[PDB]
Each structure stands twice: as C-alpha cells, then as structure tokens.
Chain A
Amino acid sequence: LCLSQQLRMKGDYVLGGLFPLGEAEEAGLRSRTRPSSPVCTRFSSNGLLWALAMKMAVEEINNKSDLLPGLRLGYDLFDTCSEPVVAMKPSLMFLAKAGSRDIAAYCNYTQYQPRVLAVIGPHSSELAMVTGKFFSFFLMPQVSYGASMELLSARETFPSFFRTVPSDRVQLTAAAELLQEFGWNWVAALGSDDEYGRQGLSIFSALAAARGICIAHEGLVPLPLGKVQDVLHQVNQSSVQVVLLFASVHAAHALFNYSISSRLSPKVWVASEAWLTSDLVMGLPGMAQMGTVLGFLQRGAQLHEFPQYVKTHLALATDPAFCSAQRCPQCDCITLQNVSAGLNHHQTFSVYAAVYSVAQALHNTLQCNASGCPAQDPVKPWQLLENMYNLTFHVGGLPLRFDSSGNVDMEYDLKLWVWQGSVPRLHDVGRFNGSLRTERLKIRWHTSDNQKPVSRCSRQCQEGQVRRVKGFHSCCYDCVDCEAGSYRQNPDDIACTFCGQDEWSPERSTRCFR
C-alpha cells in the first residue's frame, strides 16, 4: 500500500490536521539527550479512522456544487503522539509563513500569513490546552473533536477555540437535573485523581451548591492505589445510596475491581460518558449485583457512508497504479483488519462536522454567491474568527450552531443497564435537552423491592430539635430530639438542660416546671 503519501493535498486554502496516528511504547517518553523528538512506531487504529473521516469530508466539500464554487480546498495532516513535544513541531509548521520554512517573531501581525487557514485540533484536552494557548495567541481558528473540558470554554484564555462535542458542563447539569428530579438530595461524589476527574468534580460541586443538593465529601480516587480503600470506607460510613463516579476508565476499573473484591454494598452509580461505555468494566462476572448504573450519551446521526468509504479508499491504496501519484512510516504497513476493528466509531461524525463547519464559515466569510465567489484579497484567520462566532451549519441534515461558548448545541439520552446473564445492555429511559423528560416507569432498581432507593436529608426541624449540620459545606440538617423533663435551654443551641427531681416537662422541651 501507499497511504502516507496521501496525507497532504494542495489547495487554494489548506486545513491543518492533527490526529493521534502513533502511540509511544512503555519507555517512549524517553529522557532525550538531545532536542530531536521521538517517533511513535506503534500504529493505532483510531487516528487513521478519524483522518479518513476528515479526508472524506474534504473530498465531499470539493465535490459540492454550491459551497465554495470554483475554490479548491486542501488538507495537511500530522501525527500527535498524545505528547506536547511531538505536537509542537507540526503546530509551529502550521503557523510558519506562507510557502516558507520559518515563523516570525514580530511585534504586530497586521500583515502576517500562516500557511494554513484553520487547524483541526487534537483529540485529548491536554494537547487541546497546550496547543490552544499557542494557536489562540495567533488568533488561529482551532476546531477540536473530543476535547470536553469546560475549562477550555473561557474566552479570556482561548479566544479562537471551538469544538464539536458538548463540554463537560452539559453532562454534569443533566446529571444534576437527574438527581434533582429523582429527589436524591444527599449524595457522594467521586472524581478520578487526574485533571479530568479533578476538574469535573470541581464543576459538579459548584453545581450541587447552586442547586442545594448536598455533597457528603469530595473524594478522589487513584488512577492505575492504596487510598481507594479509605475512600470506599468513607462512602460506606457516610450512609449514601447514590454515588456519582466521574472517572477515567482505568480508575473506574480499579475501583470496581476493589469493590467486588470487597463485596461492597449495592448502590446506585451515576456514570460519566466515558466510563459508561465500559469496554473494560463490563467483563467482571460479579458486576451484575454491584448495584444500579445510570448515565448519559449524546445523540448524533451516524456517518453511514464511512465503512464503504474506507473499503473503497484502501482498495485504491492497494492498487499500485494510483500509488504512482511519508510522515507516517507506520501507516503503509497497516492491513485493513486493524481499521475494520473500529469501523463504527461515533466521533468520526464530530470530525466530519468540524470540517464542514470550517468550510461553511469560509463560504460565509467570502460573502460568496452560490453561482461563484468574488475575486478577493486572500482571506486570513481573524476574518474567519468574527464570522464563526454565531454560525449555523448543516451536517447532512441536523443543522448545528456555534455560540460564544464555543460549543455546538446538543441533546442527551438517559440510559440504564438492564441485566441478562453477565452482560449489561443499554436501554433508553428518558431525554434531556436542557430539562429532563424522565420515563420513570421503565426503571429496574437493584433492591429486591424494585422501588426507588432513598438518599436524602432535611432542611427542616421540629422547633426543639438541636441545630446541627453535616456535609462538605454544611448542606444538610441532622437535628435530633431530647428526652422529656430535660430541656434545651436554647433551641438554637445544643445543650439539653436539667432541673430538680420534683420538676417535669414534655419531650423536646425548652422549659421545666416544678
């Protein structure tokens, strides 16, 4: 095959592409003696799948008759091995002066010209942040797929950033609405002890405080360990039936391994998107009695032509005649099974949508008539920036819409794990599109009584009950009575107080009488 040579295509305007084509070996994060970077020799399927999605999008956009008429759109892909140093060189090349080897350290950029019009950003949020600082100083429009962190939404740090996946806050607000509507006022929350779980737990704590639902404690669990037992002890001791496990898949797998190893109590688990896919966790046999698992997934139309497109283009890459027409030396070795193993990945749709969004934004910026665009002084990024901030664009059907938040609008499905055998199976139990349209009747609860497990606390008391509070920020009452005869000298105070043997008073009293 010849496939690496296809990774670049000339055009009147060119889109830079970042994808994780290679992955490092165990020691691949080498302690380099000299500046030049490693090369991640191990191939990975998902990078090529996403790159193919982008190539399909660009080819369709070139074939489109009314978008960008008479304008030929190119692409320029590069590898990002999930590591900043590898990523910096291709981004530097993206921001290099047109047709040149170099990038200029000017004091003003009113006449500068980078060689690419826009960059299809990296997959992970770490690369998203690091490359976003650099790109957004240059005001380069960066559209990213799969970068979910809400931290990236700040326009006072990332002015030119966009993404075609919901930010984490949408998921967490749907979760808060779920907890509110089912009446689970008293809950425990867990984040994975990485930036993902850490930031997500911060966001969820802020939302919980804003909605009165009470956090027992802000737990964080290790990634790959000896402190998870203490966290699980805290959750057991806190007397909670609802636990929000917002964690990376490895940390959730470790936690559940220990949980089944500890015969943990059955509890309702609310799941983040990533863990819920549960390719790892769904294998353990005892999972069927670990409790109830609920979670969310966002809904978008499948990129149905992609499998046939991959088969067609890898057939073309097999034909030596077309090869007559190098940055990924791993790619040319790959047989088709490696790609077939993941020929349905849903984020190909997000990549496709990002490319279409940039193409539509350029069409609008040119003010182009569908019959043909005007002759124009070549466009530059900061001109795309001001047009993209309120743009609507179709993806097949499904008109999407950016706003100042940088996210695309989206809606979610609430899903539940139904059990047959050792296999859980996903079934829909409601919709969320900013408010929760629960289909309550379908739920199966883990308790044999099959009626909803309670987890709540009060914000009310009988007058004589002591003022006392619990929760991470005093979000619950736990007031309690006092015995008869004895009286609390102040109901706004703790100390129940006493009198002589010939004196009496009611229960929960604040007075005593001879």
Chain B
Amino acid sequence: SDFYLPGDYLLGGLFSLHANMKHLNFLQVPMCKEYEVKVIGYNLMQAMRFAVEEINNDSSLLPGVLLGYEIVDVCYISNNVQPVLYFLAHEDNLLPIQEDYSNYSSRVVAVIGPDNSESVMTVANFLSLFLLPQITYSAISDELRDKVRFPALLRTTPSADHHIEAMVQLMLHFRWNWIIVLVSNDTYGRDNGQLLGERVARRGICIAFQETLPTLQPNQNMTSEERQRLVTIVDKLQQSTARVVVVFSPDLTLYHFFNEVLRQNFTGAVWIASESWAIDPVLHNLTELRHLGTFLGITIQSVPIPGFSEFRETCNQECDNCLNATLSFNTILRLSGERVVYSVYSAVYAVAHALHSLLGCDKSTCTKRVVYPWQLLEEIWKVNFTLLDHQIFFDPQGDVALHLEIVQWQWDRSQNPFQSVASYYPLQRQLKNIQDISWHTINNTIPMSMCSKRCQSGQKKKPVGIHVCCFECIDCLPGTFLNHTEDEYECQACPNNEWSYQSETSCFKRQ
C-alpha cells in the first residue's frame, strides 16, 4: 500500500495522523482511526513520500540505490514504543539483546521522527542506546538542545527560543508593553509560558494576566465546571486593559474557546498565535473570526516546492478517511505555500545526501554495502548544501537555521489566506522587513496596550508596585525640579538660592 516501499535502505517515518488527546487494550495494540484525522499530519506524510520518490528518480547522486520508506502513525503520546521496536527488530521481527550493538544492522537506517515533543523524547530515549539517527520536524521544544542527554537527535526547525524572541521583538516594535498569556494544561503550555516569563522580564514587557485553559475534547458536551471555567476566563480577559493576547495551546482545545468568546462578543483583540495553531486550516475556516479582531501568528518560511501539489493529487499502517479529508481542504492548501512541508522535505534530502557521502559515491557509480546507523549519524552532522535556495546544515546543537515568518490571517480567499508581514533571521536574532498590516482600528492606527500613559512634563514617576510597567505621575512641588536627564523618579531639590515653577524641569531666582 501507500505506506511502504521496498528498497536497499529503508527510512522509518513517524507521523501523527489521528491525534485525539483522549496502552494496550485487551493485550492488543491500539488503532487510531477512532480518533479525528489531522489534515496537516497527512499533508506532511505525503510530503515525505514525495521527497523520497524524487530522490529515487533523481539520477544526480545515488548509483541506482533504491531508497525505501516505511511509515507508522505516532498518534501523539499514544501508539508509541511499539513503532520503535518494529524499526529496531531484525528481519524476523525479533530483537536480540547484546552488550554492544556496534555489529548490529537494524531494519531501518534512519528515522524521520515524531512531531510531538513527548513522542520525540520517548523515541529518543530508546534510539540513544543504538545511536540510530533521528531527525524530527517541527518539534520546537528547547529540551532537545540538551545534547549529552539526546546525542542522536537533530532538527530541521529552529528552537522555541527563537519563536519567543520573535514574539518579544514584534511586541517591542509596536510598543505593546502590556500582554495577556494563556496556556494549555500540559507541557507545551507550561514550558513555553515559563520561557516567555523569563524573556519578558529581561526586555521591558509585563504579563498583565496569565491563566490555564481547560483541555476540552473537540466534540465534548460541556460539563458545568468547564462552561463556568471558560466564561470566567473571558470575564478576566474583559476586565484587564490589554487587548494583546498570547495563546500557547494545541489547535483542538481552542475551538470551543473561540466558540465561547464568539458568544461573549468580546471583539477587538489582537491574537498572537503560537506555531501550534498559527496556520491551522480548521480554525481559520471559521468565518466568525473575521469579526473577532486581528489574528497574527509565527511560523516557518514558505518555500515553494516544485510539483508538490500535483503529486498530492506491522500494526495500524492504513488510513482511509485521510483522502476524503484532504479533498476539500486542497482548496486552501494549494493557495497556502508549502511551509512545514519544507522541513520534512529537507529532512529527507539531508538523509539522502548523508547516505550518498557516507558511501563516498561518485556520480551514479559506487558500491553497495551494509551501513551501521552510527556511521550514518556521524556523517549526518557534516552535510552542507543548498536544497531549494536555502543552505541546510546543523548547528552544534543540531538545529537548522531556517527563517521564520509572522503571518496575518486573511479571509479574501482570492489571495493566500496567510499573509507574510515580517521575516526573522535566526543567525542575526533579529526581526526584519516588516510590511503593511491591516488592523481593526478605524483609521488603521496601530493598536495600543500599556499599563499607564506617559507622564507630562515636570512630573516624577510613581510606581504602583505590582509591575515595573505601571506608574502614576507626581507634579514636582515648588523648590524641586524634574532632572529626568539624570533621574526620573524624584524631583531634585533646587539650589538654596532658587525656586521652581511647580511642574517644571528647572529652577529660578526668587525673593
């Protein structure tokens, strides 16, 4: 079927086709068709398939070596472990234990790893024993930079630190000094929230309010506690002065949050999406959001893959509903440029070139041999070449220096529904080349959020304690003056021979 292709070397593929948040059952392995299918996961799986097919067709590098692939669905945290054993096992599906594996050839030569950080780490804790190379797309968590703990892991995506840096620089560019943070009830929410807290403290931003969302099943019938929880959240959002909101959440759990706020009618906010939902077609299909405010999100650069659209048109290998689910959203995904598809494509090409150089292959003419995965891991570090106008090579931490975009949502489907407003360069750690942005304001004036208005002339600062961003102002009394040039917080006393004009910056003579 579509999920397997024989060859001289096999790539193990792990993709999250069905990913409902809600072990063996009756001592048999789970099967994920009972959960809702994800469009993006199937798209990325097809992206890997296209990449390997092109490598097979491409006569420029390999000497007719057939690069095969075998894809198993890592349904988020579930359905795990078993795929790793199925990859590691020998040709008889049994795995003999040894004191030293350096003489052992696995059934797959490399693994295109999971996307969920939890699955990535679970698989890596297995493969670290074998040093079987693992390349994971889109798994941003900065845990994976602890290389001594994860030697065999590499990534075709920038880390979470760059994402939070891009958010901070975006806020500073428009002087949004006063923001709200929402997190899901899991590691993705918590770790990113703490990272954002540290980044915020250093740079002159203040988190006005922070709260955990309930993890509703996307077709849940609401419990009383959940309903009151969501309305409490929207109440807190309404009371605070900031209209700038940061949301760290999976896509599924935000559907009913949006449905709820679309009945509270608390419109006019600036929504900053984390990359987990910045480009979600399903959420963006809700035309109501056109009337809920302005939506911005951070995501990887769009790189146009040639011919990808035309190509697109032993447990639990198969899917059926994936095709039907793709048929309709092909309308969006043809206009939408290949974004993460490039991460998958570049992972496949990186492994292809690493294999080609490991075999020391001259043009389409070299020998075929058994390859132990540790040698291929050793060679994967060392690739350096342009794939589609972007050079791909790994930092000492294992990340690839791909550019990031900030995308503004568009509802005029005659154009690309996601519009690029800025570009971020990770080597420079700078946001750059900001474009025109269509705000919700009556004259397209930049929306505003600060704790307090700037003081008038001749006033000293009066902090109200809870945040450094919040300060009232005090007029200087006679006999004192505002020496903002040297000190902002206290009106300096005038020389003994002179006086002051109340709220003024300088003294004068009196009798």
Q: Please give the residue numbers on chain A whose beta carbons come within 8 Å of chain B beta carbons, in ascending order.
A: 29, 31-37, 84-85, 88-89, 92-93, 96, 101-110, 130, 133-134, 136-137, 139, 157, 159, 198, 202, 220, 382, 470, 473
| Chain B facing A: main interface SS | loop
Partner of A133, one of B27, B95, B122, B211: B122
Which residues of B lie under 8 Å from residue A109 when comparing CB positions? 24, 27-28
B81 within 8 Å of A by Cβ? yes
* Residues in chain A near residue B194, CB distance under 8 A: 198, 220
Query: Are the CB atoms of A35 and B102 closer together than 8 Å?
Result: yes
Contact pattern, B 60-100, Cβ under 8 Å of A = 1, otherwise 0? 00000000000000000100111001101100011111011
B191 CB to closest chain A CB (Å) equals: 9
User: A34 near B131 (CB under 8 angstroms)?
Assistant: yes
Select which of B23, B97, B129, B130 is within 8 A of A103 by beta carbon.
Answer: B97
Q: Say whether B86 contacts A34, CB under 8 Å.
A: no
Residues of B within 8 A of A84 (CB): 125, 128
| Closest chain A residue to B96, Cβ basis | A102
Separation of A92 and B130 alpha carbons in the complex (Å): 13
Chain B residue with Cβ nearest A133: B122
Query: Does the CB pair B28–A29 fall under 8 Å?
Result: no
- In angstroms, how far is the closest chain B Cβ from the Cβ of A240? 13
Do the beta carbons of B100 and A36 come within 8 Å of each other?
Answer: yes
Assess the B24–A137 pair: CB atoms within 8 A.
yes
Contact B81 A137 (CB under 8 A): yes
Q: Which of A36, A159, A382 meets B101, CB within 8 Å?
A: A36
Nearest opposing residue in chain A for B104, CB measure? A35
- B27→A105 contact, CB < 8 A: no
27 A-B residue pairs with CB within 8 Å: A29-B148, A32-B151, A33-B374, A36-B99, A36-B102, A85-B129, A88-B125, A89-B97, A96-B97, A101-B96, A102-B94, A102-B96, A102-B97, A104-B94, A105-B82, A105-B85, A105-B88, A105-B89, A105-B95, A106-B93, A107-B29, A109-B28, A137-B80, A137-B82, A139-B24, A470-B465, A473-B210
Closest 3 CB pairs of A and B: A36-B100, A108-B28, A105-B89
What residue of chain A has the Cβ atom nearest to residue B130's Cβ? A35
Number of interface residues of B (CB under 8 A): 41
Please give the distance in Å from A433's CB to the nearest CB on chain B: 29
Shortest beta-carbon distance, A207 to chain B, in Å? Answer: 14
Q: In the complex, what residues of B have CB within 8 A of residue A107's CB? A: 28-29, 82, 314-315
Task: Name the residue in B26, B82, B148, B466 with the highest tally of chain A Cβ atoms < 10 Å from its Cβ.
Answer: B466
Known: A35-B130, A130-B125, A202-B190. A108 touches B102 (CB 8 A): no
Q: How far is the CA of A37 from the CA of B130 in the complex (A)?
A: 10
What is the total of A-B residue contacts with beta carbons within 8 Å?
98
Contact B94 A105 (CB under 8 A): yes
Chain A residues near B101: list those with CB within 8 A. 35-36
**Other CB < 8 Å A-B pairs besides A88-B129, A105-B94, A109-B28, 16 of them?**
A29-B148, A33-B374, A34-B131, A35-B101, A35-B129, A35-B130, A37-B129, A85-B128, A89-B129, A93-B97, A104-B95, A107-B82, A108-B27, A137-B82, A139-B27, A202-B190
A30: nearest chain-B partner, CB-CB = B148
A285 CB to closest chain B CB (Å) equals 35
Question: A468's closest neighbor in chain B, by CB?
Answer: B464
Contacts of A102 in B (CB 8 A): 94-97
B100 / chain A contacts, CB cutoff of 8 Å = 34-36
* Cα–Cα distance between A152 and B309 once the two chains are bound (Å): 45
- Return A409 CB to nearest CB of chain B, in Å: 26
A158's nearest neighbour on chain B, judged by CB, is: B23
The reply on B126 being an interface residue by CB < 8 A is yes
Interface centre among A37, A104, A107 (most CB of B within 10 A): A107
User: Which residues of chain B come closer than 8 Å to A137, judged between CB atoms?
Assistant: 23-24, 80-82
Contact indicator A108/B93 (Cβ below 8 Å): no
CB within 8 Å for A31 and B97 given contacts A89-B129, A107-B314, A107-B315: no
- Give the docked Cα–Cα distance between A34 and B103 (Å): 10
Chain B residues with CB under 8 Å of A133's CB are: 80-81, 122
Interface centre among B82, B129, B151, B194 (most CB of A within 10 A): B129
Complex CA–CA separation, A202 to B210 (angstroms): 14
Instruction: Give the distance in Å from the alpha carbon of A289 to the alpha carbon of B81 in the complex.
Output: 53
Task: Identify the closest chain B residue to A193 (Cβ).
Answer: B194
Chain A residues, CB < 8 A from B89: 104-105
B153-201 CB contacts (< 8 Å) to partner A: 190, 194
Q: Which residues of B contact A136 (CB under 8 A)?
A: 23
Q: Which A residues lie within 8 Å of B130 (CB)? A: 35
A85-B128, A104-B94, A104-B95 known; A34+B80 contact, CB < 8 A:
no
Q: How far is the CA of A102 from the CA of B88 in the complex (A)?
A: 12
Which one of A102, A105, A106, A198 has the greatest number of beta carbons of chain B within 10 Å?
A105
Chain A contacts for B23, CB-based, 8 A:
136-137, 139, 159
CA distance A417 to B122 in the complex (A): 43
What chain A residues lie within 8 Å of B97 (beta carbons)?
89, 92-93, 96, 101-103
Contacts of B80 in A (CB 8 A): 133, 137
Complex-state Cα separation, A136 to B80, whole angstroms = 12
Interface residues of B in 426-470 (CB under 8 A from A): 465-466
- A89 to B27: give the CA distance in the assembly, Å: 24
Q: Which of A96, A103, A110 contacts B28 (CB 8 A)?
A: A110
Q: Which residues of A contact B190 (CB under 8 A)?
A: 202
Residues on the B chain within 8 Å of A35, using CB: 100-102, 129-131, 374
In the complex, the answer to whether B27 meets A110 with C-beta atoms within 8 Å is yes
- CA A294 to CA B125, docked complex, whole Å: 39
Q: Which residues of A contact B85 (CB under 8 A)?
A: 103, 105
Give, as a whole number of angstroms, the nearest-CB distance from B73 to chain A: 14
Minimal beta-carbon separation of A89 from chain B (angstroms): 7
- Hey, which chain A residues are within 8 Å of B26, CB to CB? 110
- A103 and B29 contact, CB distance less than 8 A: no
Measured CA separation A130–B465 after assembly (Å): 43
Q: Out of A108, A159, A198, name the residue touching B29 (CB < 8 Å).
A: A108
CA distance A29 to B465 in the complex (A): 46
Shortest beta-carbon distance, B451 to chain A, in Å? 13
**A31 pairs with B148, CB closer than 8 A:** yes
Beta-carbon nearest neighbor of B94 in chain A = A102
Closest to B150 in A: A84
Q: How far is the CA of A108 from the CA of B30 in the complex (A)?
A: 9
Closest to B26 in A: A110
A36 cross-chain contacts in B, Cβ below 8 A: 99-102
Measured between alpha carbons, how far is A130 from B81 in the docked complex, in Å? 11
Separation of A29 and B101 alpha carbons in the complex (Å): 19
Residues of B within 8 A of A106 (CB): 93
Cα distance A31–B131 in the bound complex, in angstroms: 11
Whole-angstrom distance between the alpha carbons of A136 and B81 in the complex?
10
Q: B411 to nearest A CB, angstroms?
A: 35
Chain B, Cβ-Cβ closest to A131 = B125
* Interchain CA distance A101-B374 in the complex, whole Å: 23
Q: Which residues of A contact B125 (CB under 8 A)?
A: 84, 88, 130
Residues of B within 8 A of A93 (CB): 97
What residues on B are CB-neighbors of A110 within 8 Å?
26-28
Nearest-CB distance from B367 to chain A (Å)?
Answer: 23
Report chain A residues within 8 Å CB of B29.
107-108
Chain A: which residue is nearest B148 at the CB level?
A29
Q: Chain B residues with Cβ under 8 A from A96's Cβ?
A: 97
B93 touches A104 (CB 8 A): yes
User: Which of A29, A96, A133, A202 is most buried by chain B, counting CB atoms within 10 A of its CB?
Assistant: A133
